[PDB]
Amino acid sequence: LFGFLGAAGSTMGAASLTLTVQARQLLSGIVQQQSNLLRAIEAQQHLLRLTVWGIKQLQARVLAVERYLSDQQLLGIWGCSGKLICTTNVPWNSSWSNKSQDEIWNNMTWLQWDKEISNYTDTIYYLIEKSQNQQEVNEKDLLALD
Amino acid sequence: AVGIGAVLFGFLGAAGSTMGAASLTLTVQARQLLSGIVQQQLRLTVWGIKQLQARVLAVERYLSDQQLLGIWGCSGKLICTTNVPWNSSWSNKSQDEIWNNMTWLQWDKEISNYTDTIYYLIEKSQNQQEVNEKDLLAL
Amino acid sequence: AVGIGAVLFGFLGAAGSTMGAASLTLTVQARQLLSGIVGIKQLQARVLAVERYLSDQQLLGIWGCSGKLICTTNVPWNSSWSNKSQDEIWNNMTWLQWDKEISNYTDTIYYLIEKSQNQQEV
Amino acid sequence: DIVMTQTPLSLSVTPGQPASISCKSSESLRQSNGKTSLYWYRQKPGQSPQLLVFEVSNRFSGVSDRFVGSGSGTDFTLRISRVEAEDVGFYYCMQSKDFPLTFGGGTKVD
Amino acid sequence: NNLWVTVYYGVPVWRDAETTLFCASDATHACVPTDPSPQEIHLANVTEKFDMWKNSMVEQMHTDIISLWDESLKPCVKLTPLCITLNCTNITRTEEGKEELKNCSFNATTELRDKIQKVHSLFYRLDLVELNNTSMYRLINCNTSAITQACPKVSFEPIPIHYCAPAGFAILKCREKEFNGTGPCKKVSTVQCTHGIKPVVSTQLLLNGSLAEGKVKIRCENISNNAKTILVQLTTPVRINCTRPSNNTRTSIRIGPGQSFYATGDIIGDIRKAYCNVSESEWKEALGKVVEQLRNHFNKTITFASSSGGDLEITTHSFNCGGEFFYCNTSSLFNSTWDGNVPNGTITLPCRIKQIINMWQRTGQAMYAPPIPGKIRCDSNITGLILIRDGESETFRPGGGDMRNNWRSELYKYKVVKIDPLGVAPTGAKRRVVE
Amino acid sequence: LCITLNCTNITRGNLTEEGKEELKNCSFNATTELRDKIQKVHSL
Ligand SMILES: *[C@@H]1O[C@H](CO)[C@@H](O[C@@H]2O[C@H](CO)[C@@H](O[C@@H]3O[C@H](CO[C@H]4O[C@H](CO)[C@@H](O)[C@H](O)[C@@H]4O)[C@@H](O)[C@H](O[C@H]4O[C@H](CO)[C@@H](O)[C@H](O)[C@@H]4O[C@H]4O[C@H](CO)[C@@H](O)[C@H](O)[C@@H]4O)[C@@H]3O)[C@H](O)[C@H]2NC(C)=O)[C@H](O)[C@H]1NC(C)=O
Ligand SMILES: *[C@@H]1O[C@H](CO)[C@@H](O[C@@H]2O[C@H](CO)[C@@H](O)[C@H](O)[C@H]2NC(C)=O)[C@H](O)[C@H]1NC(C)=O
Ligand SMILES: *[C@@H]1O[C@H](CO)[C@@H](O[C@@H]2O[C@H](CO)[C@@H](O)[C@H](O)[C@H]2NC(C)=O)[C@H](O)[C@H]1NC(C)=O
Ligand SMILES: *[C@@H]1O[C@H](CO)[C@@H](O[C@@H]2O[C@H](CO)[C@@H](O)[C@H](O)[C@H]2NC(C)=O)[C@H](O)[C@H]1NC(C)=O
Ligand SMILES: *[C@@H]1O[C@H](CO)[C@@H](O[C@@H]2O[C@H](CO)[C@@H](O)[C@H](O)[C@H]2NC(C)=O)[C@H](O)[C@H]1NC(C)=O
Ligand SMILES: *[C@@H]1O[C@H](CO)[C@@H](O[C@@H]2O[C@H](CO)[C@@H](O)[C@H](O)[C@H]2NC(C)=O)[C@H](O)[C@H]1NC(C)=O
Ligand SMILES: *[C@@H]1O[C@H](CO)[C@@H](O[C@@H]2O[C@H](CO)[C@@H](O)[C@H](O)[C@H]2NC(C)=O)[C@H](O)[C@H]1NC(C)=O
Ligand SMILES: *[C@@H]1O[C@H](CO)[C@@H](O[C@@H]2O[C@H](CO)[C@@H](O)[C@H](O)[C@H]2NC(C)=O)[C@H](O)[C@H]1NC(C)=O
Ligand SMILES: *[C@@H]1O[C@H](CO)[C@@H](O[C@@H]2O[C@H](CO)[C@@H](O)[C@H](O)[C@H]2NC(C)=O)[C@H](O)[C@H]1NC(C)=O
Ligand SMILES: *[C@@H]1O[C@H](CO)[C@@H](O[C@@H]2O[C@H](CO)[C@@H](O)[C@H](O)[C@H]2NC(C)=O)[C@H](O)[C@H]1NC(C)=O
Ligand SMILES: *[C@@H]1O[C@H](CO)[C@@H](O[C@@H]2O[C@H](CO)[C@@H](O)[C@H](O)[C@H]2NC(C)=O)[C@H](O)[C@H]1NC(C)=O
Ligand SMILES: *[C@@H]1O[C@H](CO)[C@@H](O[C@@H]2O[C@H](CO)[C@@H](O)[C@H](O)[C@H]2NC(C)=O)[C@H](O)[C@H]1NC(C)=O
Ligand SMILES: *[C@@H]1O[C@H](CO[C@@H]2O[C@@H](C)[C@@H](O)[C@@H](O)[C@@H]2O)[C@@H](O)[C@H](O)[C@H]1NC(C)=O
Ligand SMILES: *[C@@H]1O[C@H](CO)[C@@H](O)[C@H](O)[C@H]1NC(C)=O
Ligand SMILES: *[C@@H]1O[C@H](CO)[C@@H](O)[C@H](O)[C@H]1NC(C)=O
Ligand SMILES: *[C@@H]1O[C@H](CO)[C@@H](O)[C@H](O)[C@H]1NC(C)=O
Ligand SMILES: *[C@@H]1O[C@H](CO)[C@@H](O)[C@H](O)[C@H]1NC(C)=O
Ligand SMILES: *[C@@H]1O[C@H](CO)[C@@H](O)[C@H](O)[C@H]1NC(C)=O
Ligand SMILES: *[C@@H]1O[C@H](CO)[C@@H](O)[C@H](O)[C@H]1NC(C)=O
Ligand SMILES: *[C@@H]1O[C@H](CO)[C@@H](O)[C@H](O)[C@H]1NC(C)=O
Ligand SMILES: *[C@@H]1O[C@H](CO)[C@@H](O)[C@H](O)[C@H]1NC(C)=O
Ligand SMILES: *[C@@H]1O[C@H](CO)[C@@H](O)[C@H](O)[C@H]1NC(C)=O
Ligand SMILES: *[C@@H]1O[C@H](CO)[C@@H](O)[C@H](O)[C@H]1NC(C)=O
Ligand SMILES: *[C@@H]1O[C@H](CO)[C@@H](O)[C@H](O)[C@H]1NC(C)=O
Ligand SMILES: *[C@@H]1O[C@H](CO)[C@@H](O)[C@H](O)[C@H]1NC(C)=O
Ligand SMILES: *[C@@H]1O[C@H](CO)[C@@H](O)[C@H](O)[C@H]1NC(C)=O
């Protein structure tokens, strides 16, 4: 299963054991990895005209920055800052899915979970940000109590 | 044909509420700081550059405050505590006078001359702490 | 008319002081790596300024060192990199001179800091 | 040091016609805030001076409409119209852009 | 016990790199009219050698001033309807200036299209080409260029330019007084921006520049032999007075719809040539200061030659004041011989002026400078020399080449660096804690 | 170049010339650098 996106196809019990493969290509190998973008800048300095392929490298950089920061912000509002599997205090509402653990973790892929739960994630994200905000308020005045 | 369902908290909805119950809605404004209406579901138009300039500005301002959180001891958090003691020449108000009575944007217009002095002391006690946490790991 | 009050830590400032006293002013120079004192090439100047900053922040995320100034890794210091004593490093040496001492051995050390994070297996 | 020079030495005696006076600056007095430094006073002979102009074409409170001072860059004027009384004084400007604070030179009023 | 690696972020280390600084201005399409108040942080105990002759700020500033000069010629009037067989004759009326002017007449195009306007103007002999005393002439660069008239509302005044540092970069500056240009300093300091730098476009003599404030500095570049340029800093500013003693009527001729050609109408009175005075007692005092400093770098006898006859931009003294371009003959300033170990008088320099000028050593983009009404009078300080070596003796000639040697003479104080914020060090018993 | 062209055939033991009827020999008044001078050229 090792290799980028190689666990697509396996069930999500075994596809979640190798999450390091995805969170290294999407954190390291995006902006830090390439130094050849500044080898094409001097070749754009040789020609004195702004070309079509110089505009498309703006739009592929600003899409690359925003795609990186809009997944680290969302992991920053929650308590899951620098980790890959984190737990929350949000109880699972059975009207999101009534489906058992053995059907989910052992007979369903992640790509079949995208096409089931996607209408509900905007509601789920509200309840993770709200419970994280209630937690840090509670551990501040507890801290100030002693 | 649509219709308004149940309502929840919304963006800036706790502005002018108070100071202690507007800090229970910190994630609502912190969610709307990076992605706006610019992201939806042929080249070099006047409205094309003005949309692209709004996307480069929105990253520069976000990374500005996100840098400043990590220089402090407070990364990935919403409420953090420091070791800098509060100085009454910055503001002398009581504890039940800024909480439960004051709102933000009234406290903002009060200490906005002193924030550059406050920001320097948070950064200085973070250098002094991280050297000490290094020098505690030599035993 | 403008006077000058008290004086605190300026921008470089401790660039000529020793590496024991320059490691207390780390926050001053980290503030200036992104902000600056700042029409299609008006944008390409900005995007490079952002991506020079994010390249160094992702590299600290590869390691364990995300969100802190002084971090610590468990790579042993190979005594052939530089064999100087601890007091003649932290009390008798600047950062501009230490940068020329181990400029050969920079890519070797970064390759080991990255490997020892994949060898956590936790 | 920045030097301020005003050219007329005294004022005409007639209370009918208004005679505008002016100062000149040895350096541009625009400060980095976006504001200038040229003032205008009136020291009554025997009494302390008082403020009349706190910025170019800006008038202090409780001041008649004769007192108005224009100026662009390094050139400066003091527009005078409808001479209303015999309020004598000593006229002089101010450089308050740097240190030391240098005034004008004095101008008698009668 | 062992010894472990740490990683520090925020470390005061810079390397030497190249970037693009941004143009400020003392307050268009390329510069930014914000007027900064820079600050300076005096460092300590750091040296940072410069090597002035390999400086990236000179290549950038040469690029931006060419970009400013082309930008102010885009809304201006193209002049391709004024390439006609002209009908030129000698002017007939202190009368030693009629040899270099003509009185040319030509059929022109008008505000309409089906009719022809017959007009006249007074050109110069340096701006005309014989084609095949009345005879038929032609302008200079119909052959190669599309001539563009400079817009009259845009003055040619040098307006000072700050260069400021971007995010992640810095600018260094040697505070010391006697710095040779290259080699280490002992006193450096970090600034936000440079000082105000005036774009004085001149050849062979530095005008309105800075001063040495020392004895006299001379700086030669150090390729294998120094047969190329050498820059004199010249403490005491010799003052030159340049003028054109002739009023000019400027008639305006309408070539097309919404565009018109500002021509030269008439000479009222005298036609006396344009010239420059130089104070002879202060000039020969100035060459005595230069020749003793050159002995500390050559130790021979030192003579000054003149540039051999050829093109005007490479031999004569080219400058701009009053909106017109003087080409002055400096043969009577540069012959001397100094064989090892107060003059009464002034010096007259012959000066010719042109209007079709092709600037920045480039083909294809000529410019018709319009005539200026009135009598031009202008004063400027000579604060530098641009000399070239031909190699006992050694003779020196007036310098030439690119305009970048005007910017080694200003930007020699500065240096742009890039700040590398990561750095590793051996630490102690500080190993990462195990969980 | 969008003008009237005065254009005719080419004035050139059998296989040495084949495609005469594709080319033609045109001639026309072209402009030059000097605005009052006119010139003829003979392009194919
Ligand atoms: C080295 O450095 C020196 C020192 O700065 C420098 O000398 C100065 O050059 C400037 C060039 O801009 C000179 O400025 C010009 O000055 C003349 C004369 O001004 C004096 O006289 C008038 C009348 O008596 C006084 O009011 C005034 O205060 C001065 O005492 C002016 O006539 C010029 O103004 C014209 O040009 C300006 C720019 O376009 C316009 O803003 C202005 O309104 C004038 O233009 C109008 O009138 C023209 C007809 O006259 C007409 O043709 C135009 O289209 C327009 O309608 C200008 O301000 C200054 O005097 C010099 N100072 C000294 C001491 O010599 C050198 O030039 C410099 N050398 C080099 C090589 O860089
Ligand atoms: C520049 O170098 C001088 C060298 O004398 C530094 O001065 C000494 O620094 C040591 C460091 O612990 C002190 O123990 C001495 O007392 C200092 N000497 C004096 C006379 O004060 C100086 O600190 C260096 N500059 C900077 C900015 O650190
Ligand atoms: C510490 O550094 C030394 C450098 O001298 C390393 O020893 C050499 O490493 C190179 C590159 O791998 C080899 O080609 C040489 O054969 C090594 N020398 C010997 C004598 O074997 C050494 O590997 C480094 N690491 C440790 C743990 O000592
Ligand atoms: C333009 O050139 C033509 C000749 O190429 C000049 O025409 C004649 O020149 C003679 C020379 O003395 C005169 O005697 C004639 O009277 C001219 N005839 C006309 C119709 O002008 C003509 O003078 C030239 N124009 C100018 C302004 O010099
Ligand atoms: C301007 O145009 C006029 C008219 O086309 C030119 O006058 C001609 O001059 C020649 C030379 O003597 C005569 O043979 C023609 O008969 C003239 N034409 C007419 C209509 O009189 C004149 O030469 C042109 N001048 C310039 C400088 O181009
Ligand atoms: C250049 O030549 C033209 C034409 O020969 C001169 O224009 C003449 O000017 C005088 C004086 O005003 C008039 O009497 C004539 O009638 C003009 N001739 C024409 C054809 O208009 C002009 O003056 C000359 N320029 C100079 C500086 O001498
Ligand atoms: C060059 O111009 C300066 C003025 O800028 C001349 O200096 C004047 O010299 C006369 C001597 O006759 C004095 O009376 C004036 O007071 C001087 N003026 C200033 C402003 O200093 C100088 O003489 C000129 N030199 C030459 C060679 O022409
Ligand atoms: C202006 O420059 C020219 C050369 O650029 C000088 O012309 C020379 O003058 C000397 C004087 O005896 C002659 O012997 C040379 O033959 C001339 N050169 C040529 C090429 O013929 C001229 O002297 C300069 N003007 C002044 C006033 O010195
Ligand atoms: C140097 O230049 C001068 C003029 O610019 C040349 O002419 C000499 O001028 C002086 C003026 O006082 C006379 O005393 C000399 O007699 C002139 N020279 C001759 C040869 O007559 C001069 O020729 C140039 N060259 C030298 C070597 O002086
Ligand atoms: C240098 O310039 C001055 C004025 O700019 C000229 O001085 C004039 O000289 C003539 C005789 O040479 C006198 O009649 C005038 O009275 C002078 N002017 C003044 C205002 O007094 C001088 O001629 C120039 N030097 C030259 C041309 O060599
Ligand atoms: C342009 O076209 C005309 C006809 O419209 C040509 O005129 C004649 O062409 C024949 C064919 O060669 C010649 O024999 C005649 O001598 C031409 N007439 C004249 C008066 O010369 C003319 O030749 C064409 N132009 C060219 C360059 O071929
Ligand atoms: C190029 O221009 C010349 C201008 O003279 C043309 O020649 C004239 O053409 C007309 C129309 O056929 C004839 O009536 C004239 O007799 C011609 N003049 C001469 C001197 O031959 C010529 O036809 C033009 N060529 C083209 C291809 O348009
Ligand atoms: C440009 O001009 C050069 C100089 O020759 C001049 O122009 C020609 C057309 C004749 O009129 C001659 O009598 C002049 O002195 C030419 O050598 C050159 O070929 C011309 N063209 C270009 C493209 O440079
Ligand atoms: C692919 O499917 C086959 C058949 O069920 C299975 O044996 C194999 O393990 C699957 N591989 C992955 C990577 O899911
Ligand atoms: C959902 O699952 C529950 C048991 O977990 C079951 O009782 C219910 O019928 C299911 N819903 C539907 C629509 O079948
Ligand atoms: C469970 O898996 C088998 C084969 O993998 C499949 O046929 C079956 O439909 C799955 N169960 C459900 C409820 O889809
Ligand atoms: C507005 O103010 C009233 C009292 O002044 C308070 O009861 C109410 O909660 C406030 N509204 C919000 C949204 O805070
Ligand atoms: C600040 O608050 C204290 C209350 O302890 C009071 O004594 C003091 O006068 C206040 N200062 C001002 C300027 O209001
Ligand atoms: C709270 O602040 C408001 C100011 O808008 C003031 O009117 C009110 O009296 C304060 N509450 C108390 C208890 O003083
Ligand atoms: C450290 O290494 C250098 C060169 O490898 C050597 O000259 C020096 O003697 C070494 N230090 C000690 C204490 O042996
Ligand atoms: C280390 O300190 C000593 C004095 O204790 C000094 O003589 C020596 O020069 C220093 N080392 C270096 C490399 O400067
Ligand atoms: C770094 O390596 C180079 C050879 O590439 C060597 O010349 C230099 O001395 C080394 N640096 C140090 C500080 O020894
Ligand atoms: C200037 O001084 C430095 C400092 O020693 C030296 O390296 C350089 O060679 C000197 N240059 C000249 C031209 O004397
Ligand atoms: C340079 O020119 C200015 C302006 O005319 C003048 O004040 C200064 O004295 C001149 N410098 C010298 C050395 O004459
Ligand atoms: C030049 O011509 C104008 C135009 O009338 C005239 O007023 C002036 O006296 C003339 N002479 C000069 C400027 O010496
Ligand atoms: C070098 O200069 C000295 C005077 O400083 C002089 O005596 C000596 O002759 C010169 N050298 C030569 C080779 O001429």
Three-state SS string over chain E comes to CCCEEEEEECCCCEEECCCCCEECCCCCCCCCCCCCCCCEEECCCCCCCCCCCCCHHHHHHHHHHHHHHHHCCCCCEECHHHCCCEEEEECCCCCCCCCCEEEEEEEEECCCCCCEEEEEECCEHHHCEECCCCEEEECCCCCCCCCEECCCCCCCCCCCECEECCCCEEEEEECCCCCCCCCCCCCEEEECECCCECCCCCCCEEECCCCCCCCCCEEECCCCCCCCEEEECCCCCEEEEEECCCCCCEEEEEEECCEEEEEECCCCCCCCCEEEEEEHHHHHHHHHHHHHHHHCCCCCEEEECCCCCCCHHHHCEEEEECCEEEEECCCCCCCEEECCCCCCCEEEEEEEEECEECCCCCCCCCEECCCCCCCCEEEEEEEEEEEEECCCEEEEEECCCCCCHHHHCCHHHEEEEEECCEEEEECCCCCCCCC
Please give the structure tokens belonging to residue B25: 């809605």
The residue count of chain B comes to 139
**Would an 8 Å CB–CB cutoff place D22 in contact with chain C?**
no
Residue A84's closest CA among A72, A94, A96? A72
One-letter amino acid for residue E143 of the chain: N
CB-side exposure of C83: number of CA atoms within 13 Å?
2
Residue E324's closest CA among E255, E250, E256, E252? E250
Q: Which residues on chain B are in Cβ contact (under 8 Å) with A75?
A: 76
Q: Which residues on chain B are in Cβ contact (under 8 Å) with A82?
A: 76
CB-side exposure of E295: number of CA atoms within 13 Å?
13
The Cα C95–Cα C72 span in angstroms is 18
Give residue D38's domain range.
1-110
Please give the structure tokens belonging to residue A92: 């699972």
The Cα E425–Cα E7 span in angstroms is 7
Ligand 12, atom 2: nearest CA belongs to which residue? Answer: F29
Measure A112 CA to ligand 16 centroid, in angstroms. 12
Distant-in-sequence contacts of A107-112, Cβ < 8 A, 24+ apart: A107/A11, A108/A11, A108/A12, A109/A8, A109/A9, A109/A10, A109/A11, A109/A12, A109/A15, A110/A7, A110/A8, A110/A12, A110/A15, A110/A16, A111/A8
Say which residues have a Cβ less than 8 Å from residue E331's Cβ, sequence separation at least 6. E306
**Look-up of token digits 């540092």:** E165
Please give the structure tokens belonging to residue E305: 């030659």
The Cα A53–Cα A44 span in angstroms is 10
Say which residues have a Cβ less than 8 Å from residue C90's Cβ, sequence separation at least 6. C18, C19, C20
Contact E339, E301 (CB under 8 A): yes
Ligand 8, atom 15: nearest CA belongs to which residue? Answer: E309
Say which residues have a Cβ less than 8 Å from residue C78's Cβ, sequence separation at least 6. none
Residue E323's closest CA among E238, E210, E201? E201
Q: Which residues on chain C are in Cβ contact (under 8 Å) with A50?
A: 40-41
Residue A108's closest CA among A30, A45, A25, A14? A14
The Cα A134–Cα A131 span in angstroms is 5
3-state DSSP helix/strand/coil % of chain D, to nearest 5: 0, 35, 65
The Cα C25–Cα B127 span in angstroms is 7
* N-to-C CA span, chain A: 51
SS3 C122: coil
Ramachandran sector of residue E10 (left: φ over 0; alpha: ψ -120 to 50; beta: rest): left
Preferred mutation among B19, B27, B52, B68 to probe A, highest tally of A CBs within 10 A: B27
Beta-carbon separation of C55 and A82 below 8 A? no
The experimental method behind these coordinates is: cryo-EM
The Cα C70–Cα C10 span in angstroms is 20
Radius of gyration of chain E (CA): 27
Beta-carbon separation of B126 and C30 below 8 A? no
Angle (nearest 5°) at CA A41 between A37 and A44: 135
Q: What are phi and psi of E178, to 5 degrees?
A: -105, 85
**Would an 8 Å CB–CB cutoff place B79 in contact with chain E?**
no
Which DSSP state fits B31? T
Contact A96, A116 (CB under 8 A): no
What residues are in contact with ligand 23 under a 6 Å CB criterion?
Answer: E 180, 182-183
Angle (nearest 5°) at CA E368 between E363 and E370: 160
SS3 C71: strand
Contact partners of E by the rule of 3+ C-beta pairs under 8 A? B, C, F
Dihedral sign, Cα of residue E63, residue E68, residue E71, residue E76: negative
Q: Provide the resolution (angstroms).
A: 3.1
Contact E138, E128 (CB under 8 A): yes
Say which residues have a Cβ less than 8 Å from residue A9's Cβ, sequence separation at least 6. A109
Residue E31's closest CA among E226, E163, E182? E163
SS3 C46: helix
Residue E121's closest CA among E162, E160, E157, E79? E79
Ligand 22, atom 4: nearest CA belongs to which residue? Answer: C104
Structural domains of chain D, count: 1
Structural domains of chain A, count: 1
Any atom of ligand 13 within 6 Å of the Cβ of E144: yes
H-helix or E-strand spanning residue B55: helix B46-71
**Would an 8 Å CB–CB cutoff place C15 in contact with chain E?**
yes
One-letter amino acid for residue B53 of the chain: Q
Q: Which residues of A64-86 are buried (b: 16+ CB within 10 A; e: fewer)?
A: bbbebbeebbbebbbbbeeeeee
Q: Which residues of C touch A (CB under 8 A)?
A: 40-41, 43-44, 47-48, 50-51, 54-56, 58-59, 61-62, 66-67
Say which residues have a Cβ less than 8 Å from residue A96's Cβ, sequence separation at least 6. A117, A120, A123, A124
The Cα E121–Cα E124 span in angstroms is 10
Please give the structure tokens belonging to residue D40: 């205008």
The Cα A60–Cα A66 span in angstroms is 10
Residue A98's Cβ-count burial label (10 Å; 0-12, 13-18, 19+) is: exposed
Q: Which residues of B touch C (CB under 8 A)?
A: 44, 49, 52-53, 56, 59-60, 63-64, 67-68, 70-71, 75-76, 120, 123-124, 126-128, 130-131, 133-134, 137
What torsion do the CA atoms of B45, B48, B54, B57 make, to the nearest 10 degrees?
-70
Residue E399's Cβ-count burial label (10 Å; 0-12, 13-18, 19+) is: buried
Measure C16 CA to ligand 2 centroid, in angstroms. 10
CB-side exposure of E223: number of CA atoms within 13 Å?
8
Give residue B20's domain range.
1-139
The Cα B104–Cα B19 span in angstroms is 6
Residue D21's closest CA among D46, D41, D1, D49? D41
Any atom of ligand 9 within 6 Å of the Cβ of E427: no
Contact E85, E100 (CB under 8 A): no
Task: List Cα–Cα distances, F19 to D11, E428, F7, F10, in angstroms.
Answer: 102, 90, 17, 10
The Cα B71–Cα B86 span in angstroms is 20
Please give the structure tokens belonging to residue E219: 């700086």
Ramachandran sector of residue B29 (left: φ over 0; alpha: ψ -120 to 50; beta: rest): alpha
**Helices B115-135 and B46-71, interaxial angle, to 10°?**
50
Residue E317: CB atoms within 10 A of its CB come to 22
The Cα C101–Cα C93 span in angstroms is 11
Q: Which residues on chain E are in Cβ contact (under 8 Å) with B134?
A: 6, 427-428, 430
Contact A132, A78 (CB under 8 A): yes
Which DSSP state fits C24? G
Please give the structure tokens belonging to residue D18: 């208004």
User: Which of E 415-434 lie inside 8 A of C, CB atoms?
Assistant: 419-428, 430-432
Ligand 12 probe mutation, F3, F6, F29, F36, most atoms within 8 A of CB: F29
SS3 C30: helix
Antiparallel, parallel or unpaired: β E148-149 and E77-78? antiparallel
Q: Which residues of D6-34 are buried (b: 16+ CB within 10 A; e: fewer)?
A: beeeebeeeeeeeeebbbebeeebbeeee
One-letter amino acid for residue F35 of the chain: R
Q: Which atom of ligand 13 is nearest to the CA of E138?
A: 11
**Would an 8 Å CB–CB cutoff place D98 in contact with chain C?**
yes
CA distance A8 to chain B (A): 25
Residue F9: CB atoms within 10 A of its CB come to 10
Contact E190, E40 (CB under 8 A): yes
